C-alpha cells in the first residue's frame, strides 16, 4: 500500500512511513513554523537552568543554545528570525541595514564558539593561567560586540521587523554579564569591576525589557482592522510574537543572581489562541472569513478576559446537520458546554458557547486527570450545487481528535468527536504545526510544549460561520502549586484559587509571563492553595507593585502577620507598568511546613485604608536549619552597636532609654546552643548601655523606688507602679483618672524638680519618655515660661490574642519582635508612643534655684497613661537662632520678675510685720497678751494676699512665693496653737468643731472667711461647758460675736458659789451716732449720711471676773434671731 508508490529515497529514511514530505513541518517548512520551533526549544532549555549557578550545566546550556542559533544549515536561524516578523507585518527590512545585521551576527557566531572553548578549557583547568587569560579575553570582546551590535537589531523605521532578532540577542547579552557576576572573583575581577557589570546588567534588562514590550504593542496595534481576515492576522502576531519574544522578555529577571542565587522554578500563565478552526484559501471557493462577524465581535467571542489560572476537566458538544440536498451533509460543531476548574479547589465552572438548539445529537467528553498535547481537527466545506445553477456552501467542523497522557500514571489515550458527514470536503489541522513539542530525544507525550486550556467559539446564525477556537497554557504551568525543597519556587498571582469571592485580574504586557493579581479597597484578599511533599523550612518574597506605601497581612502556614510594602511607582494606570514599576518585599518570619499530600492555605490581604497593590508572583526560598538563629543575631549585633558612640564607650545622645531596654529584649532572642560567647558579650554590652543611660538622666530616681520620697517624684494617692508586664521592661507607671466625689474633681499628678547644681548654663535639655497608651495626659516642662503638651496614645501594642500561648510566662524576644513590628507603621501626630521635649537654660542663679519641672497630670475622669523610660538629658550648648530666641525670652522674664519682685515685697513685708506683732519676743515662744482672735484673722487674711505662692498653670507645683508663704503659716499656726493653751476654756475658738461643748442638735460651726464660728440658729438651742479654773485669780473674758436678727444673745460665766457676769450682744451694737448731715455745717450745705449695716463685722467684749471655786460654767444662747461666735476666751490678767 504505502510501499508501492514510494519512491527509493523515501524509503531508505529509516522508519519510512510516509510522513516525509513534512518531516517536521514546524521544524524546516515555512519561516514562522521555524522561528517558533525554535523559540519554544530555547525558552525550554533556559527554563531548565534558571538560578544554576555551576560551570557543568551553564557549559552544556550554551552548547545547546549555539547550535540553535547557529547551526550549519545552510540558511541562517537569524534570518529566519527577520523572516517571520517580516511575513507577520508585510514589511521587508532594507537591504544595506538587513545585510549589516547578517554580518554581524555571523561574527558573533564565530566568537560564542570560542567563548564556549575557553570555558570549557577552563572548567578542566581552573586554575591555569591561559585558560584565565583565554577565558577572560573572550568574555570582554563578546560584551563590546554586544555593546556595538545593539543597535544595529533596533534601526529606526525597523525596530517591529528586527523585534525577534533583538530578543534573542538582548538574551544572550544577558546571560553573558550573568556570567561575570558568577564567575568574576574566580578569574580575578575587582570587587569594583564585578559590581560595574552587576548595575549594568540591572540598567540593561529594564532597557531590552520595555524595548521588546513597547515594539510588541506598536506592531501589534498597526495589525488592528475591521474584518475577520485582518483578525487572523492580529492573533498570528499576538500568538507567534508570545512564544518568541514576550516568553523570553519574561526570564530576564531570573539571571539576577544576588536575587536568585540557586534554582528557580518560572511557570509561564498566559494563554496562547491556536488559529481558528475554520478552512481557509480552498480553490475556487474561499474562506470560513469571507462572510463572517467583524474583527471586534471576534476579539470579544473567542478571548477571554483576565482570569485565575484554570484547566479543562469536560466537555459537550451539541451537533447540527447542514444539507442543501439529501445526496450530501455535514454534521457539525454548533456549540458547547465546557466545565473547568481553578487550582485546589473542588469547584467545578461550566460555561455555554454557540447554540443548543434544534440539534442532531449530543457528545460528552471527559478529561479528568490527562492533559490533551495535541489536537487533530478537519476545517471542512460543504458544497452544494442546486436548481437552477446557483453554488451553496457551508463551513464547519465535523471532526477533531483530542490526544491525550494521563497526569498521574502516564499512559495514553485519544478521544474523537466524528459525527456522520457525507461528500465533505476536508482539510486537516494538527496543532503541533503551530505550538510544537520541545525538541528533545522523547516522544510528543513526554516532551509537550502547552496543553489544552479552553475553548472558545465564534458563532453568528446571520452568515452562518460556527468556528471553534481554542486556547492553550505552557506546560511551565503546574496544576497543583507544588513547592519542592531544593529550589526557589515561583508561584504567580493568577494561580490563586476562587474560594467565593470577585478577584480583580489585569492584563499583563509580557514583563511577567501572565496576567497580574490586584488587591483594592473593593477586593481586599486573595487565597493560594499549595501541595508541599517534603517538610521544609522556607522564607517567602513577594513581587509587586504599588503606588502607595501601606501593609499587607499573612494567614495561614501555622502563623500569621503583617508586613510593610513600599510605594513602586507614581502617576500612571495600573495598565501603563514597565520593569522597573516592580520590587521585591521579604516577610522576616521562617515558615515550617510538614510534608502532606493535602492542599496548605496562604491568604493575603490589605487593610481598610489601602486602595491598590498589585501582586506579580510569591516564592518560596529554602532556608537550612540555622537561618532563624543567625538573622537574630545579626539583628541583635546591629541594635546593640546603634546604641553607642563609635569609641564603644558612651550612650549617643539621640538614643533613648527605651532604645537600650528593646536592644536588650533582641539578645534575648539568641541560641544558648549556638552562639553562647556572641549573646554573653551582647549582654556584658547592653548592660553597661543601661547604667550608661541612668548615669546620664538627670532624674532622681528612675525605676521609681521611693515615691513621694526626699528629693524624687511627688505623687498623687492612686498612682501605681508596676513590675513584671508586657511592653515595659522592669518598672512602669499606670496614672489612673481624676477622681470624682460629689461636687469635687482631685486631679491625678506627678512631677519633680531637677535642682540648679546639675545644670549648665546655655544649654538645652530634653524630656524623653515612652507612653504605652493614654488619653487626656498632660506633660508639663517649666523653667522660666511654662510649656504644655496633651498626649493621646492608641493601645496599639497589645495583641487581642495571646503572644505566649501555653507558656504564660512573658517572652521578652517575641514580645519585642511583635512591638517593633507595631512601631513600623506611620503616624507621629501627638499619637506616637516616644515623646521627647526640649527645655532650655540661659543663666543659671543659685539663689533663686529655679531648676527644671517636669509634671504629668490627668484632670480627665476618664483620662488614664501608662508612662516609662522617663529621662532627661543634656543635649548640647545651645548657638545660632536658638540661643538669640533664648536671650529674647529670658530678657523679657526678668522684666516680669521685677515687677513681681515689687509686688511681692511689699505684701510679703506687711504680712510679715502683722505676724511679728503676735510675739513679745524675737523667738516666737511667747505670745502678746494683748492678741485676740481678730489678730489672728488679719495675719491670716494677709498672708493669704502674697501672690504667685503657686505656678499658674499647674497649682500644684511650687510658685516664686511658696517658701515665703509657708514660713509666715507655720509662724502663725505657731501663734495660734499658744492662744489655746493659753485660753482655760477648752476648745474656746472652735477649732476641734464641737469637742468639750454640750450642745443641743442644731448648733454648728461652720466655715465662716477661713476661721471657726459657731453658730447658733434657733433660741430653743444652747451651749454650754463646764471648766476648771485657778481659785482666787483674775482672770478676763473676751468674746467675740456677731448678733443678727430682733434679740438679744447672751454669754453668762459664773463659779459654783454666788459670782456672775453677763455679756450682751444685740443689732444695736452697730447703730451709729451718724454724722446728723455733716453736722448741720458743711461747704455749700449738702447730705451725708452714715452706715448701720456691717455685716463682716464682729464685736469683741471684755469684762473681769474672780472665782472664789476650782469649777465654771459657760453658757451661750440667744432670745431670737442668729447668733455667731468667733472666739470665747478666759486668761489671766496681766495686771
Given amino acids: 500500500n504505502a510501499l508501492q508508490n514510494m519512491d527509493y529515497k523515501d524509503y531508505l529514511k529509516m522508519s519510512a512511513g510516509n510522513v516525509s514530505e ?45 547550535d540553535i542559533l547557529w547551526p550549519s544549515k545552510q540558511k541562517s536561524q537569524w534570518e529566519i528570525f527577520m523572516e517571520q516578523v517580516e511575513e507577520l507585518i508585510n514589511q521587508k527590512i532594507a537591504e544595506y541595514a538587513r545585510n549589516k545585521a547578517l554580518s554581524e551576527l555571523e561574527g558573533l557566531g564565530n566568537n560564542y564558539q570560542l567563548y564556549l572553548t575557553a570555558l570549557e578549557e577552563w572548567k578542566e583547568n581552573p586554575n591555569g593561567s591561559r585558560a584565565l587569560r583565554d577565558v577572560r579575553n573572550r568574555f570582554e570582546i563578546l560584551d563590546s560586540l554586544f555593546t556595538q551590535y545593539m543597535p544595529s537589531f533596533r534601526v529606526t523605521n525597523f525596530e517591529v ?17 550573568r556570567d561575570a557576576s558568577i564567575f568574576g572573583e574566580e578569574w580575578g575581577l575587582s570587587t569594583s569591576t564585578i559590581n560595574n557589570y552587576y548595575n549594568r546588567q540591572m540598567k540593561l534588562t529594564a532597557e531590552y525589557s520595555d524595548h521588546c514590550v513597547k515594539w510588541y504593542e506598536t506592531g501589534l496595534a498597526k495589525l488592528k482592522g475591521s474584518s475577520a481576515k485582518q483578525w487572523i492576522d492580529y492573533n498570528q502576531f499576538r500568538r507567534e510574537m508570545t512564544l518568541t519574544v514576550l516568553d523570553v522578555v519574561a526570564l530576564f529577571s531570573n539571571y539576577d543572581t544576588r536575587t536568585y542565587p540557586l534554582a528557580t522554578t518560572a511557570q509561564l500563565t498566559r494563554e496562547v489562541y491556536t488559529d481558528p478552526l475554520g478552512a481557509v484559501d480552498v480553490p475556487n471557493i474561499g474562506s470560513w472569513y469571507d462572510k463572517a462577524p467583524s474583527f471586534s465581535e471576534i476579539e470579544k467571542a473567542a478571548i477571554r478576559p483576565p482570569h485565575e ?82 453554488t451553496y456552501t457551508f463551513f464547519g467542523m465535523p471532526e477533531t481528535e483530542f490526544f491525550m497522557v494521563n497526569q498521574l500514571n502516564n499512559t495514553r489515550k485519544t478521544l474523537t468527536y466524528k459525527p456522520a458527514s457525507k461528500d465533505i470536503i476536508d482539510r486537516t489541522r494538527d496543532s503541533e504545526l503551530e505550538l510544537p513539542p520541545e525538541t528533545s530525544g522523547q516522544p510528543n507525550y513526554e516532551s509537550y510544549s502547552h496543553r489544552l486550556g479552553h475553548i472558545t467559539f465564534i458563532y453568528s446564525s446571520s452568515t452562518s460561520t460556527y468556528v471553534p477556537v481554542f486556547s492553550w497554557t505552557h506546560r511551565s504551568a503546574d496544576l497543583t502549586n507544588t513547592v519542592k525543597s531544593g529550589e526557589i519556587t515561583q508561584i504567580p498571582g493568577g494561580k490563586s484559587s476562587y474560594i467565593g469571592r470577585n478577584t480583580y485580574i489585569i492584563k499583563g504586557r509580557g514583563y511577567t509571563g501572565g496576567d497580574l493579581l490586584a ?82 492555605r496562604l491568604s493575603i490581604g490589605i487593610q481598610t485604608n489601602t486602595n491598590l497593590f498589585i501582586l506579580d508572583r510569591i516564592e518560596f526560598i529554602p532556608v537550612d536549619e540555622t537561618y532563624e538563629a543567625e538573622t537574630d543575631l545579626e539583628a541583635a549585633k546591629k541594635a546593640v552597636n546603634a546604641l553607642f558612640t563609635n569609641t564603644k564607650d558612651g550612650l549617643q545622645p539621640g538614643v533613648t532609654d527605651y532604645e537600650v531596654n528593646q536592644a536588650a529584649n533582641l539578645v534575648e532572642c539568641l541560641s544558648d546552643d549556638l552562639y553562647p560567647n556572641e549573646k554573653r558579650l551582647l549582654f556584658d554590652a547592653v548592660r553597661e548601655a543601661k547604667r550608661l543611660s541612668e548615669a546620664r538622666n538627670l532624674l532622681q530616681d528612675p525605676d521609681f523606688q521611693e515615691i513621694n520620697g526626699e528629693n524624687g517624684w511627688t505623687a498623687s494617692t492612686g498612682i501605681e507602679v508596676i513590675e513584671g508586664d508586657a511592653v515595659f521592661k522592669g518598672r512602669y507607671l499606670r496614672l489612673p483618672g481624676a477622681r470624682e466625689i460629689d461636687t469635687e474633681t482631685y486631679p491625678t499628678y506627678l512631677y519633680q524638680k531637677v535642682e ?33 503638651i496633651v498626649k493621646n496614645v492608641p493601645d496599639d501594642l497589645l495583641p487581642d490574642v495571646p ?122 515662744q511667747q505670745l502678746n497678751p494683748n492678741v485676740e482672735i481678730t489678730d489672728l484673722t488679719a495675719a491670716q487674711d494677709l498672708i493669704q494676699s502674697i501672690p504667685y505662692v503657686y505656678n499658674e498653670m499647674f497649682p500644684e507645683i511650687p510658685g516664686m512665693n511658696y517658701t515665703k508663704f509657708t514660713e509666715l503659716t507655720d509662724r502663725l499656726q505657731q501663734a495660734w496653737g499658744l492662744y489655746d493653751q493659753r485660753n482655760a476654756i477648752p476648745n474656746g475658738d472652735y477649732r476641734n468643731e464641737l469637742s468639750n461643748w454640750n450642745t443641743t442638735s442644731g448648733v454648728n460651726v461652720q466655715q465662716i472667711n477661713h476661721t471657726s464660728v459657731l453658730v447658733i440658729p434657733n433660741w430653743n438651742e444652747q451651749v454650754s461647758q463646764k471648766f476648771t479654773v485657778q481659785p482666787n485669780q483674775r482672770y478676763v473674758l473676751r468674746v467675740t460675736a456677731r448678733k443678727e436678727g430682733v434679740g438679744n444673745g447672751y454669754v453668762s460665766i459664773r463659779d459654783g458659789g454666788n459670782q456672775s457676769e453677763t455679756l450682751t450682744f444685740s443689732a444695736s451694737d452697730y447703730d451709729t451716732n451718724g454724722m446728723y448731715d455733716t453736722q448741720a455745717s458743711n461747704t455749700n450745705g449738702y447730705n451725708t449720711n452714715s452706715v448701720y449695716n456691717d455685716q463682716t463685722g464682729y464685736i469683741t467684749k471684755t469684762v473681769t471676773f474672780i472665782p472664789y471655786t476650782n469649777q465654771m460654767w459657760i453658757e451661750i444662747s440667744e432670745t431670737e434671731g442668729t447668733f455667731y461666735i468667733e472666739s470665747v476666751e478666759l486668761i489671766v490678767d496681766v495686771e
Fill in 309 to 390: 489560572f484554570d484547566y479543562i476537566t469536560g466537555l459537550t458538544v451539541y451537533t447540527k446537520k447542514r444539507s442543501f440536498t439529501s445526496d450530501r451533509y455535514m454534521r457539525y460543531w454548533a456549540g458547547h458546554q465546557i466545565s473547568y476548574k481553578t487550582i485546589g479547589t473542588s469547584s467545578t465552572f461550566t460555561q455555554m458557547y454557540g447554540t443548543n438548539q434544534n440539534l442532531q445529537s449530543t457528545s460528552n467528553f471527559d478529561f479528568t486527570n490527562y492533559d490533551i498535547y495535541k489536537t487533530l481537527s478537519n476545517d471542512a466545506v460543504l458544497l452544494d450545487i442546486v436548481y437552477p445553477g446557483y
Fill in 519 to 600: 488587591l483594592t479597597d473593593r477586593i481586599g484578599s486573595c487565597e493560594f492553595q499549595m501541595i508541599f511533599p517534603e517538610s521544609q523550612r522556607f522564607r517567602i518574597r513577594i513581587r509587586y507593585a504599588s503606588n502607595e506605601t501601606s501593609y499587607i497581612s499573612l494567614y495561614g502556614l501555622n502563623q500569621s502577620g503583617t508586613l510593610k510594602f513600599n510605594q513602586t511607582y507614581s502617576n500612571k494606570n495600573e495598565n501603563d507598568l514597565t520593569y522597573n514599576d516592580f520590587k521585591y518585599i521579604e516577610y522576616p518570619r521562617v515558615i515550617s511546613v510538614n510534608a502532606s499530600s493535602n492542599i496548605q
Fill in 803 to 924: 503572644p505566649v500561648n501555653n507558656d504564660g510566662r512573658i517572652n521578652r524576644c517575641s514580645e519585642q519582635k511583635y512591638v517593633n513590628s507595631r512601631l513600623e507603621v506611620e503616624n507621629r501626630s501627638g499619637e506616637a508612643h516616644e515623646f521627647s521635649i526640649p527645655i532650655d537654660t540661659g543663666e543659671l542663679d543659685y539663689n533663686e534655684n529655679a531648676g527644671i519641672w517636669v509634671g504629668f497630670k490627668i484632670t480627665d475622669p476618664e483620662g488614664y497613661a501608662t508612662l516609662g523610660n522617663l529621662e532627661l538629658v543634656e543635649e548640647g550648648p545651645l548657638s545660632g537662632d536658638a540661643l538669640e530666641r533664648l536671650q529674647k525670652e529670658e530678657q523679657q522674664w526678668k522684666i516680669q520678675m521685677t515687677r513681681r519682685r515689687e509686688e511681692t515685697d511689699r505684701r510679703y513685708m506687711a504680712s510679715k510685720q502683722a505676724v511679728d506683732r503676735l510675739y513679745a519676743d524675737y523667738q516666737d
Fill in 22 to 66: 513534512y518531516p517536521g513541518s514546524p521544524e524546516v517548512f515555512l519561516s514562522e513554523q521555524d522561528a517558533v520551533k525554535a523559540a519554544i526549544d530555547i525558552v525550554g532549555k533556559l527554563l531548565t537552568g534558571l538560578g544554576v549557578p555551576f560551570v557543568g550545566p551553564i557549559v552544556s546550556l550554551y552548547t545547546q543554545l549555539i
Fill in 756 to 788: 540648679e547644681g546639675v545644670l549648665k548654663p546655655y544649654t538645652r535639655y530634653r524630656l524623653r519618655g515612652f507612653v504605652g497608651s493614654s488619653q487626656g495626659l498632660e506633660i508639663y516642662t517649666i523653667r522660666h515660661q511654662t510649656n504644655r
Fill in 161 to 177: 521587523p528586527f523585534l525577534t532578532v533583538y530578543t534573542m540577542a538582548a538574551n544572550l547579552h544577558l546571560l553573558l554579564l
